Ligand binder design. Structure first.
Ligand SMILES: Nc1ncnc2c1ncn2[C@@H]1O[C@H](COP(=O)(O)O)[C@@H](O)[C@H]1O
Ligand SMILES: [Zn+2]
Ligand SMILES: [Zn+2]
Ligand SMILES: [Zn+2]
Lengths: 619, 621, 614
């Protein structure tokens, strides 16, 4: 079905506030969106087409097996370009003259931040945005009451298509925890038998086999249990992210984490690759389920990228249902305190210089060149509840000058990851290579202004719980249609209770939200964590079938999968805006639901933009 | 060892001795009523409760591989006749066999006492305070002992939640398969055989494809949405809509073909679906189910027809136990002229069972099938109002010819009365006895829980205990098992955050988790694991709590003593910590010890109050 | 006597000794930090906490009718000079040996406490103890509430209506309800028809003329017209709440009626307060601790405030004065009204030091300070902070930027100057002051760290529910918390989310207050209205209500003589010995339970530490 009952408001002041208040909010909202659009364009990241169309009216200028063979000889040739990091950003040179890439200006970024920082504490704008957010919830409630039967009928009438055969993407999941506890326990106990003489660990210079590792712990294969591994988050982990980090060590053993959960170890990440490929097998068996695993590049060593690429190539860690995102833990303070890094610039060099070198000279890093074909972007992870005592501004030390053992704040990490990524994408675009996106963890806990940083620089975010405390930011995320990969089960076990999770309000109000498992090892109990994640949410918040499919469609849209794959998944016209881009035959989402979302977004954007043009100045 | 919370003072219940004495006398009297009827029907009664009551009491090879009637036990030549709704056994098919035939007047008298009890305000407040105390003590116990409980679970070798026995204590066979599983089975059937005749419409024979062609539905076009067998939010407080979910694609014919045991194809499709589910339980090893099979009492041959269906299709599994449900649809049958009177329905349900016990060769397939049948169930929309109170003025079953459906207590009493006599006869021959495990307290009148408290070994749902403190207090003291299905409740009557399950578990009531109807509610391929997950996440249950629920499920189950000996250990019959082995249960003795002591202390509080008065009444007379 | 709950076991606290020992050492260290600064500033410290800490440290732990400067104490000829933001006293106008605070020591103490509040292992321990206290109280009530009520019924005469209740946290500018303000305004418009109340762009206007410009008559005026009451639109909009201080959205009307300094010399504002004082005196048992504003903008504010009170006889036996300093340095610096933060400090403290040294120089202030008990800090606490107060922070004289100094910056220098003032006043036998700031309502949690070190007691304290170690430390230290659930319901935290029942259940010294009756309450008795709603919503018992009233009196700044008359001569005793049901209507069962619970918790922490010291 396509036609549906529509809610309309008649009379003057349709927004419920006097025009003077509306104009003030509109000016700030439009300016904020322009700021985000600028940096998305700068970094070659996506910006909502619907938002861009409405903003163009007020815009001065126009807007907008693979690893079987690894032969460097057939790879693209060397461009001979020189590389050097200047003030925390990689610069490209002809060999010599600087290549005119749009190198970000820090002062411009700081000025933009200050505008948003003042905006998020603007009282009058806060009330206006909160009123609009309540309006969106009220309108959606009316839409459901007057059209859910019609929406259900459309789902019923579609042939062949149901929730079990629509595409679903685990938009936010970590490789180190992609397996369930029982799966990990079985894999370890199988490994204790198959190969028995291989040296798997060196303890104080003493080479040890896996059996000798377990005998040192006074543990037998029979004695091992899920409780023994102790890798599951419990109620005592709540508000204790440090205790959650400890769950990554089985049996409280860093050696077991090294052997089975690390890509780089004495076994060349043999066990970790095998477990991932087993997870890949389950994903391929399910056909319709996909995941975007997070692999760790710590930036501690210059060789991490090459070793990670070789690890994937040698073990053939690849699947059509898996896309890779590289996460950078914010652990500079730990590294600096141990003397393993000289300055924050060295950490940035270990993260981006190998990438820049691979682009200019693919044969220089042949394994990395192949691996990057499946790497979509960067992620930033750390205990986001930790306080920040340093404000990122022009007075902050540059990365080369940052030699103290203090961890730079969240915005410091994000800006330099963004700045280097933006230049890298420009270089890779010129050669026709795949570009990257920035998809950080944001809003889970800690200062609200972390969401200001992501709004400026992030393609999409994960968690985003604190948007409920910032009406203007939540309103902007809706207007910009910024994807949010949420993990209610993870939040329930760490920060925010399930019944208080803001996901229901985000979904009702039209934010592009998707469901994710985060760390199935520490949380889920079934053999299909993503289905279990969908189950709990659908029951506790009593989500309708249309709501479930809408979440699945959102997960695909915010994923890093290629256009060709998405064309098969959602249809060749999926890139179109509104109902035109939706095919119920492939998504099981009625056009009535998509139509309502598109009209609601268009109405909201029209309200803000038309208010700006309606201002009358007096000489 | 674990930290124990102790009270110090003169009155440690919180109430004046007069309030304690009044409540204690009624509670003890209520417990005696239940003990009398459990003994009458050879049903289990909490050993801990009985021991405290005694102080106040003046009285002290596939099983279906072969079917050879000749090798079966011989005929005892006993006559059978239903008298006033209860079967009587006779020496010849002649004297009446001296069996404890229930007296209805005695039953009504006990009911009236309990009905007055459940509205006693002073007693209600007393029990409510005790329930709050039980919750408070558990909260302090958890705070002061959860770390020690967790350490014990870490210490025990090999044992974890994934290798402990879990029983789906309440699940219906007609809905034991998930929606995706049913869709795949239907799609496969359409491909395989056009030979099968599945349905006759107006005397016109039709095949499976022809039936689907009439609806103009192709195999490819079919989807889970087309089946519409899933309970959505529109089913909330709409049990009639849930009834409609039993029809695939909203068709009764499809339900008969795939979901029913008696049809043109001898229920082969339903048997295969069950046996496919049974395979998964065997693959999981540690997961078991108690599927509910329907005996409607509509036809005298239903028991034989159900037994032949199991024997011919070899529907058996070591991880599956059978409980037979009797839908309360006498009004539907009577209105259609299918039963003469309610007595005929009882005879259709119980006469074949008595005859099989007396003369196994008369019902050779029923004799084999009953080896895996453990008890009876009563299912219907419990929200439906009742206009008739079951009393001596109520028509006897043979006299009940009106099309009105008898009330809940009417069904339960006569199911109980006939079951008790059947158990006595089966015990004489050494055969397995039965128990009465009805759906109770999900919705509707509170007094339904009064009926089950008297006659039921355990119940399912039991949500309304939260609205009757005295009944919830009694169920705790009697340790009456409660099979709860929180997901089913979320889509039908009560939301997850309002569900009283966490309060029941904390206060010490014997609660277990169940799926009810996986077809209409669950989304994953392991519904029971999905059920445990949601409950653990919403109520932040610990590993100890999860394992304690699994232990309760086994204890509430109908599995044999030998089976439970391997599952829970040879000494599982012992009360308190002595009966618990973490090496098989993963439940720390700290948890079991706390429960056992709390139950004994509560019984001691009530028992001493009764003793005190009788001591002080001696001078008075 | 009452049924008591006892714990038997090897680990009675619920955690292994190693976890207990680590938490106890930090908890003991934190308590010593507070005791050090309370002693330095001559502020109270919980006697029960001190006794258990001593074992761990051998070192010991009408008044305004006549104003005659000649009769006042003579001049000591002592010099005064700000030194790094703190007033220093000199023998003439050598340095007087006063315990001048050391900033480096303060910063070092802060860093330790800041680390403690983000220590995961200690946070879980404290949270577990907090849950234990709630569980223990739950069990206590279940078994003893009947006995507590029986004592209340048996005690002669005393009930909730004849026990003393003190509004421990209320602002003078909002101490009247909206209907009271409306009646007063209409009354004034019919009086003093020939008197200038305001000049509008060089045009003198009388009270009637001001209303003529607004096109409003006395009849037209209504409660709606004033628009001084908060509503659902005021939620999380403290700026809108400040706007409510302007009747009819007019700053002039606020100036005429709700300010002590104006053309009419604060005539109307004094009269309204006296009307409230009269209502308080008629009630006999209800008291208040009103907040008066000293902005620190001008050097003469203290003298002008004291003159206002003396001339209009703004005094009541049921009222104690606390002086609030709005954190508005940014506004003053931006407009050029101040050059640096030290000037703000000079305007706030120098007149007080001068009055102490030479009372005859500030004769009105000398009399007025007899009824002033302490200082207060007020501002939109939800505002973020981008500057951390440490040794690298500018000194007050060097702070010239328009940025508002952080909360700790205000609190430390107010604490430092106040402490020296108290030492001087004690030498002369004058009344000393205490620091009672608004804290924990919103904004950063570390504000509660600052008040824990420097504040006698706090108001609001809502964020303690998010900081287990801080709430556990406040409980052990028995820091008074003045809570205003109705105010929070209309500003930050809804009534059903208010942590007051948890604090009261766990034994924290909590009291009920109205905060701003003008913007919040509807009835003729805002304090009674505040108590009633708390009782109904949380189903508080008569014992719970009376315990709150007793806590309010104990937190208050009323004299020892008055409190002895109120709570009895022995009220200073600890535990049940200090409670008289005939005076408080609080059964000794309740007081006994609180005392035993507090002592047991303190013993657990202290005895665990002693084992390492033994
Ligand atoms: N979980 C249930 N609750 C209530 N009535 C039920 C349930 N299951 C089956 N019934 C009733 O039993 C009859 C059908 O049995 P069956 O075909 O096995 O599903 C119908 O009258 C249903 O209303
Ligand atoms: Zn994550
Ligand atoms: Zn059921
Ligand atoms: Zn205040």
């Amino acid at each position: 079905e396509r036609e549906f009952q529509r809610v309309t408001i008649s009379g003057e002041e349709k927004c419920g506030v006097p025009f003077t208040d509306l104009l003030d909010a509109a000016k700030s909202v439009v300016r904020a969106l322009f700021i985000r659009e600028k940096y998305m364009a700068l970094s070659l990241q996506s910006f909502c087409p619907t938002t861009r169309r409405y903003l163009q009216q007020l815009a001065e200028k126009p807007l907008e097996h693979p690893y079987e063979h690894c032969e460097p000889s057939t790879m693209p040739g060397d461009l001979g370009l020189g590389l050097r990091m200047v003030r925390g950003v990689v610069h490209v040179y002809t060999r010599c003259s600087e290549v005119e890439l749009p190198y970000p200006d820090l002062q411009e970024f700081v000025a933009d931040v200050n505008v948003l920082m003042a905006l998020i504490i603007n009282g009058p704008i806060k009330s206006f945005c909160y009123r609009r957010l309540q309006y969106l919830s009220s309108k959606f409630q009316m839409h459901v009451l007057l059209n859910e039967m019609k929406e259900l009928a459309a789902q019923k009438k579609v042939p062949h298509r149901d929730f079990y055969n629509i595409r679903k993407v685990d938009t936010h999941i970590h490789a180190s925890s992609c397996m369930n506890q029982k799966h990990l326990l079985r894999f370890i106990k199988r490994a204790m038998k198959r190969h028995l003489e291989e040296i798997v660990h060196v303890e104080q210079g003493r080479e040890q086999t896996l059996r000798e590792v377990f005998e040192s712990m006074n543990l037998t294969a029979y004695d091992l249990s899920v409780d023994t591994l102790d890798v599951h988050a419990d109620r005592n982990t709540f508000h204790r992210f440090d205790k959650f980090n400890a769950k990554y060590n089985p049996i409280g053993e860093s050696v077991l984490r090294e052997i089975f959960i690390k890509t780089d170890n004495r076994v060349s990440g043999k066990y970790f690759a095998h477990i991932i490929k087993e997870v890949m097998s389950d994903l391929e068996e399910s056909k319709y389920q996909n995941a975007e695993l997070r692999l760790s590049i710590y930036g501690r060593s210059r060789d991490e990228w090459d070793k990670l690429a070789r690890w994937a190539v040698m073990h053939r860690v690849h699947s059509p249902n898996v896309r890779w995102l590289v996460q950078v833990p914010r652990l500079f303070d730990v590294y600096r305190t141990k003397g393993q890094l000289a300055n924050f610039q060295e950490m940035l060099e270990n993260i981006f210089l190998p990438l820049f070198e691979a682009t200019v000279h693919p044969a220089s890093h042949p394994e990395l060149h192949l691996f990057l074909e499946h790497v979509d972007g960067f992620d930033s992870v750390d205990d986001e509840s930790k306080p920040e005592n340093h404000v990122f501004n022009l007075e902050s030390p540059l990365p080369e000058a940052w030699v103290e053992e203090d961890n730079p704040p969240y915005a410091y990490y994000l800006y330099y990851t963004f700045a280097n990524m933006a230049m890298l994408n420009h270089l890779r675009r010129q050669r026709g290579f795949h570009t990257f996106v920035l998809r950080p963890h944001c809003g889970e806990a800690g200062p609200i202004h972390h969401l200001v940083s992501a709004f400026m620089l992030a393609e999409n975010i994960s968690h985003g719980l604190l948007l409920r405390k910032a009406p203007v930011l939540q309103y902007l995320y809706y207007l910009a249609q910024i994807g949010i990969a949420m993990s209610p089960l993870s939040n329930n076990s760490l920060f925010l209770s399930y019944h208080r999770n803001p996901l229901p309000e985000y979904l009702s109000r039209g934010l592009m939200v998707s469901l994710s498992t985060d760390d199935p090892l520490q949380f889920h109990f079934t053999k299909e964590p993503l289905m279990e994640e969908y189950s709990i949410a659908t029951q506790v918040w009593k989500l309708s079938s249309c709501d479930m499919c809408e979440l699945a469609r959102n997960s695909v849209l915010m994923s890093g999968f290629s256009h060709k794959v998405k064309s098969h998944w959602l249809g060749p016209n999926y890139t179109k805006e509104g109902p035109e881009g939706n095919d119920i035959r492939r998504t099981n989402v009625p056009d009535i639901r998509v139509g309502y979302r598109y009209e609601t977004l268009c109405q909201e954007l029209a309200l803000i933009t038309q208010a700006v043009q309606s201002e009358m100045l007096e000489t």
